[PDB]
Enzyme design. Structure first.
Site, PDB file in Angstrom:
ATOM      1  N   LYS A  76       0.902  -1.142   0.000  1.00  0.00           N
ATOM      2  CA  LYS A  76       0.000   0.000   0.000  1.00  0.00           C
ATOM      3  C   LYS A  76       0.939   1.188   0.000  1.00  0.00           C
ATOM      4  O   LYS A  76       0.797   2.254   0.550  1.00  0.00           O
ATOM      5  CB  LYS A  76      -0.912  -0.162   1.209  1.00  0.00           C
ATOM      6  CG  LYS A  76      -1.734  -1.436   0.941  1.00  0.00           C
ATOM      7  CD  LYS A  76      -2.599  -2.025   2.073  1.00  0.00           C
ATOM      8  CE  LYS A  76      -3.649  -3.008   1.536  1.00  0.00           C
ATOM      9  NZ  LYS A  76      -3.999  -4.320   2.136  1.00  0.00           N
TER      10      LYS A  76
HETATM   11  C1  U5P Z   1      -5.232  -4.677   2.625  1.00  0.00           C
HETATM   12  C2  U5P Z   1      -6.330  -3.905   2.235  1.00  0.00           C
HETATM   13  C3  U5P Z   1      -7.586  -4.209   2.746  1.00  0.00           C
HETATM   14  O1  U5P Z   1      -8.598  -3.538   2.435  1.00  0.00           O
HETATM   15  N1  U5P Z   1      -7.753  -5.235   3.600  1.00  0.00           N
HETATM   16  C4  U5P Z   1      -6.690  -5.989   3.959  1.00  0.00           C
HETATM   17  O2  U5P Z   1      -6.931  -6.913   4.779  1.00  0.00           O
HETATM   18  N2  U5P Z   1      -5.447  -5.715   3.489  1.00  0.00           N
HETATM   19  C5  U5P Z   1      -4.376  -6.659   3.835  1.00  0.00           C
HETATM   20  O3  U5P Z   1      -4.868  -7.945   3.331  1.00  0.00           O
HETATM   21  C6  U5P Z   1      -4.499  -9.039   4.175  1.00  0.00           C
HETATM   22  C7  U5P Z   1      -5.664  -9.669   4.950  1.00  0.00           C
HETATM   23  O4  U5P Z   1      -5.210 -10.899   5.524  1.00  0.00           O
HETATM   24  P1  U5P Z   1      -6.143 -11.841   6.464  1.00  0.00           P
HETATM   25  O5  U5P Z   1      -7.202 -10.935   7.009  1.00  0.00           O
HETATM   26  O6  U5P Z   1      -6.758 -12.899   5.562  1.00  0.00           O
HETATM   27  O7  U5P Z   1      -5.146 -12.423   7.450  1.00  0.00           O
HETATM   28  C8  U5P Z   1      -3.523  -8.391   5.151  1.00  0.00           C
HETATM   29  O8  U5P Z   1      -2.209  -8.420   4.555  1.00  0.00           O
HETATM   30  C9  U5P Z   1      -4.012  -6.950   5.275  1.00  0.00           C
HETATM   31  O9  U5P Z   1      -2.977  -6.037   5.654  1.00  0.00           O
END
Ligand code: U5P
Ligand code: U5P
Lengths: 323, 322
Positions: free
Chosen positions: A140
């Protein structure tokens, strides 16, 4: 690895018939639990890691990585954390990769101990590259052009990532210094943040508007405009969108108004998104265009191979329904 | 341990400036330092070696304390680390007397892999030893569970005083950046409000809500979150990044958020106008308008003189506003 990300994803999708994106976000407890479990079980999983041919092809501290585990703890106490961190990641990848369209590593999980985790991250990307599995670095990123070109180098030259995530709130001109390298005439792929999974994501993404369009729609259009300007898709690369797995109205809009866009969708599992709704609303017959990311629900499971299989089968059942 | 608010106010009382020196060394800077040093019998490394606090850095101290000829022959793998860290130490040593704060942009420290992160750690340790307030500029943004890792890296590992944050994903992330419930710790951040890139209007000005451009909405929400976390009661704050080239916005922000903390990059390499920026953003507690200058100092062949001139100029303008 001499093909653009668009083509690499298409081929893998055709090979394994899924859109599962496996997230590798190891936290301190995961690494500690791995170390604990491996000590209790004669280090079975590490011995299996050590069997794998491509482990001999990583860049950083092989002399440590390839050591016997009981040697590490006895003679190499300072390298212990590196060793168990790195072997945990290799273990997840070894167990789950046959189900994965792509792996996404979130940079935040690799930085909090300082340089040690960045050596781990480098070896993780080296390893995935050798296995030929499509990669996303989730970072990001956002800055002015002169500054962001350093992330471009880290992500696309040093790690050799296939893609990354980018926040374009500062503006879309940054993409010229991320998805394109003027010196080398190389093109790269990214996913821009469109609608995110955090509970207050509407505060700017939906409340802000221009004329009668919400910010997330404007941002998606502007990203696409920049992709066309850059000729990404002519170079087998793309700018796609991050749209959360809980954002069912937005997923529908994005897929409706940008029919051939690539979507990355986190939020299933740990964040409790609805898989049937998400996959249905974002569906494309080229389902590499709707990547379903699952991190903690796989990596924090005692049997991640079986966890990844469950999600693979569940996704494919919903894919079959969409047909 | 009194809080960033107090650190800033006290340093301002000691040095009477709001200069923020940006330390963003690129590969050319490191290579050019290496070349110059060879050509002048390592004059600057020799000076670095004679400073007290070099003996207090955490990572590879032994290596840093060696003579340059002993590195080049006997520790060649450490050469880049050695010259990169010594360029940073040289800039700090030449310029710190003029700096209210130093801001390090993370992006410059990652593209060689782990080596630059050890450099970054040593830089923060060195600044911490010199009691100089610090900012890690990384423009972090993620969901809560994730950003906790940046809280640890920035505020526990580097022991930074503050960081920059992009709150376009939402403001809730700040609860896991500026606050650690488990430890009852509070930290300061600057959020992106109006940035210096040429196309910054596209979302920051052209989007709106109610009758206000997006940058105003975002500034207000950040302050709402700051009060919810009670940072100012713990002598911390959430402040704003407002470009030194964005006079209308600076004027609006200083007028409508009279006592806000502002970080202003864009003078020097990006052509902002120091007088207009400082007038439009002025506050008598002028630690509330930090003027960041990176490349115009680090890419100047006489960086001590470059810092001095910015300090002097800021001071004469600060005099004008009384
Ligand atoms: C980034 C953007 C977003 O809107 N939501 C997110 O969860 N993320 C990133 O995606 C991953 C989610 O992982 P999990 O919830 O399945 O463990 C994580 O890397 C988060 O930073
Ligand atoms: C961050 C936000 C912004 O709006 N503008 C910026 O320039 N930055 C960062 O500040 C630094 C500017 O340094 P210089 O132009 O004086 O060299 C740099 O770290 C950039 O990323």
């Amino acid at each position: 690895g001499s093909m653009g990300f668009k083509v690499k994803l298409e081929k893998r999708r055709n090979a394994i018939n899924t859109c599962l994106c496996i997230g590798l976000d190891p936290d301190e407890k995961d690494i500690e639990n791995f170390m604990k479990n491996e000590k209790e079980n004669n280090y079975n999983n590490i011995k299996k890691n050590l069997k794998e041919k491509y482990i001999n092809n990583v860049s950083i501290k092989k002399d440590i990585l390839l050591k016997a585990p009981d040697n590490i703890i006895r003679e190499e106490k300072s390298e212990e954390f590196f060793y168990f961190f790195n072997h945990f990641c290799f273990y997840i990848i070894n167990e789950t990769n046959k189900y994965a369209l792509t792996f996404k590593m979130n940079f935040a999980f690799y930085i909090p101990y300082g340089s040690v985790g960045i050596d781990v991250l480098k070896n993780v990307f080296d390893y995935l590259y050798e296995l030929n599995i499509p990669t996303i670095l989730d970072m990001k990123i956002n800055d002015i052009g002169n500054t962001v070109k350093n992330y471009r180098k880290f992500i696309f030259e040093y790690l050799k990532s296939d893609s990354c995530t980018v926040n374009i709130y500062m503006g879309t001109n940054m993409l010229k210094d991320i998805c394109y390298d003027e010196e080398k005439n190389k093109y790269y792929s990214a996913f821009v943040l469109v609608k995110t999974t955090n509970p207050d994501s509407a505060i700017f993404q939906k409340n802000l508007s221009l004329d009668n369009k919400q910010a997330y729609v404007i941002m998606a259009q502007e990203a696409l405009n920049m992709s066309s300007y850059l000729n990404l898709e002519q170079n087998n690369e793309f700018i796609g969108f991050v749209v959360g797995a809980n954002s069912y109205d937005e997923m529908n809009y994005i897929r409706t108004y940008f029919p051939n866009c690539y979507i990355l969708s986190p939020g299933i599992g740990a964040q409790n998104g609805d898989l049937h709704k998400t996959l249905t609303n974002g569906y494309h017959k080229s389902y590499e265009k709707i990547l379903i990311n699952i991190g903690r629900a796989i990596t924090k499971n005692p049997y991640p191979q079986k966890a990844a299989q469950m999600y693979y089968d569940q996704i494919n059942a919903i894919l079959k329904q969409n047909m």
